[PDB]
Design a protein around this ligand. Structure first.
Ligand SMILES: O=S(=O)(c1ccccc1)N(Cc1ccc(I)cc1)[C@H]1CNC[C@@H]1N(Cc1ccc(I)cc1)S(=O)(=O)c1ccccc1
Ligand SMILES: [Cl-]
Ligand SMILES: [Cl-]
Ligand SMILES: [Cl-]
Lengths: 99, 99
């Protein structure tokens, strides 16, 4: 698809067999989702920006489906105000900026 | 152009006659620049980010060039981690996400 930026670029994702809404975010290095369980090992991380920093759990090699596109990559889980799909997974679905 | 996301989408902008580096950020509603001098009056603006909300300065109808593309619109100024070009100006230069 071609997604406009007149509104926030929100899409449906499937992860851990759950359907969620998330923001396609070219300014985010990493994908960050609100508190949820994920399988496997994890390590803590801090991410930050306007407003300060939050602590997240980093899970690697997680399967995700983004607007019907299957991918795998690292997912950070923690108290983000919005679910974010970052560049680590946008690349895998072939997402580009165009003007 | 078409910008892939394997690296941060950092571009050159021009504002107040000066070149600066800024991030094309589809996760930011607004354009937010590092502390600088801009003309005219400003108004207060609360913006939300990963750690919470903060107050920044809002300047309207400011000339800014993004990758050579001329724009005129609202620029926020505050303690942003990096200069950010958000959806208000991305929309104005005709940028979309595509996959
Ligand atoms: O500072 S920011 O929260 C911001 C928001 C609005 C306007 C200006 C700034 N930021 C930009 C940012 C850019 C580079 C770096 I280094 C750190 C932050 C965001 C906006 N989109 C990407 C960043 N994030 C996503 C986000 C989007 C919307 C909201 I509401 C909250 C978080 S992030 O969770 O912080 C982030 C930080 C590190 C790794 C992955 C994700
Ligand atoms: Cl990854
Ligand atoms: Cl590619
Ligand atoms: Cl504007």
């Amino acid at each position: 698809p071609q997604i406009t930026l007149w509104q926030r670029p929100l899409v449906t994702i499937k992860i851990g067999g759950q359907l969620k809404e998330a923001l396609l975010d070219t300014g985010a290095d990493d994908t960050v989702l609100e508190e949820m369980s994920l399988p496997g090992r994890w390590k803590p991380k801090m991410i930050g920006g306007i407003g300060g920093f939050i602590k997240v759990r980093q899970y690697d090699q997680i399967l995700i489906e983004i607007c019907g596109h299957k991918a795998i990559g690292t997912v950070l889980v923690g108290p983000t105000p919005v679910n974010i799909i970052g560049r680590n997974l946008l690349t895998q679905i072939g997402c580009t900026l165009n003007f």
